[PDB]
Design a protein around this nucleic acid. Sequence first.
RNA 1: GCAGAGGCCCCGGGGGCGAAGGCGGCGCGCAGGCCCCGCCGGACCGGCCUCUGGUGCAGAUCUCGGCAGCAGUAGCCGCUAC
RNA 2: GGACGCCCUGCGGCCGCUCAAAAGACCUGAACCCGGCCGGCCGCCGGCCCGCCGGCCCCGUCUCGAAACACGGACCGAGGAG
Lengths: 133, 142, 148, 257, 125, 177
Amino acid sequence: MKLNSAVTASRRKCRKAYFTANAETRAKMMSSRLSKELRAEHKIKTMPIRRGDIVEIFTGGHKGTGKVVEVRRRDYKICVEGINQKARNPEAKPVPYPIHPSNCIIKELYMNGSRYRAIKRRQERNAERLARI
Amino acid sequence: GRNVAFSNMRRYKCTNKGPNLIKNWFNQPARKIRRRQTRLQKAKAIFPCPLQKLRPSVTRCSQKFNLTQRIGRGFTLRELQGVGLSAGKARQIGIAVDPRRKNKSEESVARNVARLKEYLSKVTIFSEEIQQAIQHQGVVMP
Amino acid sequence: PTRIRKSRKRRGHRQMGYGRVGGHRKHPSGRGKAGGLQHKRTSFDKYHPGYFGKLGMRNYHVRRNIEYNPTINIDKIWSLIPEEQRDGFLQRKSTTEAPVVDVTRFGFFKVLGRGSLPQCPIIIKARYFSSDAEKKLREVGGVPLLVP
Amino acid sequence: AGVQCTAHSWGPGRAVARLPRKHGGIGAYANFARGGHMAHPTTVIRRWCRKVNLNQRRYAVASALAASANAALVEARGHRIADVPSIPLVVDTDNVTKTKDALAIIKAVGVLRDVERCKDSRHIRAGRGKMRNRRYITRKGPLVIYNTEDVARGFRNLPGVDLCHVSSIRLLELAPGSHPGRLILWTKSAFASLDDVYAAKQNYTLPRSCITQTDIERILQSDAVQKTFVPKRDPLVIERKVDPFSSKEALARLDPS
Amino acid sequence: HPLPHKIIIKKRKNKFIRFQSERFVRVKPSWRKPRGIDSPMRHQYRGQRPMVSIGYGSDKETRFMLPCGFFKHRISTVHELKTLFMNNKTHAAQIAHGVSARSRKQILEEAKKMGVRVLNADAKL
Amino acid sequence: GIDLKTGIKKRKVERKEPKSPNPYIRLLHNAFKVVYENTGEDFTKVLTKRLCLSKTNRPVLSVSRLAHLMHKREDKIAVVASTVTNDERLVTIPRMTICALKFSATARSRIEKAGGRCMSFDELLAEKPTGDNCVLLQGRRSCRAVCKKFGSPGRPNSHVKPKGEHKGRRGARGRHS
RNA sequence: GCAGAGGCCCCGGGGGCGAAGGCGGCGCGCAGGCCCCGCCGGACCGGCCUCUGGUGCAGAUCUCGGCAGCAGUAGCCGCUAC
RNA sequence: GGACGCCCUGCGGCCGCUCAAAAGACCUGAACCCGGCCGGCCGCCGGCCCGCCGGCCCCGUCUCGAAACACGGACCGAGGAG
């Protein structure tokens, strides 16, 4: 049971925060389980989802693999390539089905140079914690 | 009505307007905590010294309570002379001093001079052993 | 509480126990004990004798502790002796070592004599005594004494 | 609330009820008016807390402790105690800081079916309680009492478990929902110190023991009580009314001749 | 089939309807005791509608008994149906409205095992 | 229509059973009801009612009163359905056997020091169900303070004291005040 | 009977295999009421013991919202006119 | 957030489509009131197959007494006072 008075267990305050979170918080709230292979290499369980990451959906609806091309931060959902709603007519612009970051596993990360630094910081702190404090 | 004792309750005043003449005690379980924290903070500030100063034993006033004694405000200058301590010195060694109080009875000086002697044995004036000193809690000599 | 209360059982009854002919109206007899020498005279005279008027002299400030007089009866003076001490005292009787009870240290100033002292000499010291207390204590062989 | 507006009775002649109305003519300032005050507004001056005598608070804590000792009262309260070897249950624990180790003690001691009943009973509550920081209800189960043992960390995340020191036992825990009979797992320090805790109550004398129905029933069937009994006279015979002339037997029973 | 029983004599067949329920929709048909200062219903004048009284109460032998000849015990779980099985020959089972058609099949199979009648057996089918 | 109202006086109410939550008082009453029904004896009928009486109608009987009320009948056993308290004023308690619903801690320690026996209605029910060699005693109901202000203070024959402070002269000084 | 609280509901209460609600129909109860069944509906809901209250409506020239019949009715007649 | 096709001077209509569902400007969707179609001659209580026979003044309310030519009340729904 939570023993920190400063954290709130109020449904209203918790749901107010979720739906009014600042973009830095919103981004870490939008995290996905790294794949078993990627988890072993980077030694971290979850990474915040980013454009160009390849994710596989395990949830039964609209389930497939693809690259996130769009992160809809305001609705806390991501658009995977290939995950699209049925079009009314064949010759029409595809409409993406929004998928919750939680519903997918990150098979490949867009590595960049900041992400290399960020995944290293997280693993250094995880080393101090895994050294039993 | 019939056989009842007439109420001696005064009618509520300033009930919807004016000064707030109603007090509520929902702050009572919090107030205990706030003052315990304050005493713990003051105790930490002076670890070896006790929180309370030695105060005299005085006979409770009126005949209803004459044969019973209670802690008072301060030792009289005449009582201090018996233990040979000045007012300023006694205050330095945590002994409260009352210039206004006059002894009243010879027996009072004797009880109070004995108090100071028992305290002077107990007191350990220090000018890391301080850390191993045990701070006294509550009234000094109860 | 509110569920078990009688008022809840009076719903559907309109006036709710206050009567159709005259019902609940605000203050029908007046506010407070008002009308006692007039309309409510019968109540003040039947159950409240002495309500109206001034009686004896007035003390502008009463000294409660100067007018304080705790009293003990000859019946309850052996209660003050503790049980272990009391049984042996009674058996030995004795004049040279007889219990001295100072009722002031037990918080009593004057000794009255309601009941009967046990038949064994006892010395009782007090601020003041009553004649019957003195006579019952002097009959037992005890001595009434005054205390400083 | 409801009094922040300016409303006055319109008067007695405008074909409108005499309730107070705002400038527009809108009902205001009454229990029956939308936006009006409560007729009797709720207030914090209600006595929220009642009072109990220490001898009476300590009677209940002791009587609840005694109710825990009964393995029929414990089963009636709902707790599953079939695997429990003995009630009262005392367990020689050491310092249990692991939920993995606590489960092995809960299993070996024989309270697992009870700590599982609670785990498998978490559910969203019925009502606006769900919206008021009271969403999940879990059935209460074992209560561990500890003295001089660090058993808190290991047994705390286990579900439906409660933990109390022998120095401050809590009645609400001993009798959950005013029902006496809590399955209590006692450490061997707590059960040995229970007689010291009762001694430390400064002048308390434990409620004197009283008998039960079984003792009264046995007395009523005792040789002395039964022998004193007298057999009452035989009961009256009633019989429904019959006209005698209808039946010769009815006539014979009235007048034989 | 239940034990044989005594003919169930219902003293009244129709429901007790409040006075003036027919004239208004604000007045719903539930029984409210008539308490008016000039009430035809409370005075019980000729042509007024019946007044609820303990007299219309049924024989205590057959009170609460359904037309089948059994009394009704609502069951919502297979454990709860095991009390209806516990030596009950005078009782029958009503599954609640909440139990799903997935659960009714299990309750019907347990009832079949213990020979308990289920009043709403054809439900959700 | 029958006339059963021209000689019938209305029905009175008694405390046929106890109103006490205490499960022990209820168990004693149910048992004494059985003994009275099983043997119709006055001691058991009187005791079944006494256990159903209210706390106000069941006053305390001290060991000083009990000793006086038992000076001639020392061999007999007292049976108060009430608390037996102590009179610190009597400093030599005699030996007696007393059956009471509750005994004060001082009364039990005085009685057993003196050499007596503090019984309980369960021991009474087995040992003496119909109360052989038993005298049932009662304390003074009128002793209460509430019972002394019952009446109209203010009438010439009242003999009752006014409830509140009063502090006045009209009606209190005399018959002509 | 309502709305909450603390417990229980023999492997841990009933629920997208359909909750509450709504509509129609039985049964049950002297009755307040309850229960089921069908249909709509689409996520919650209780029975019992203990506890708590802003706890039951036909009325108040009741409050606020809807809104009928009158009724295709009264009316759509200053300022000359198209 | 409404594919297509057919129709229309257009609007709009129809056929459907997207969806689990139109849920279509929005969840449920009550009563009052109303329109189409189908049944009936129609208030309540009782007996019968069911339209006859018999009974039945408008409640609430103060009042000695109200169906009153005393007063409040068109209807419905929510709120509404120990």
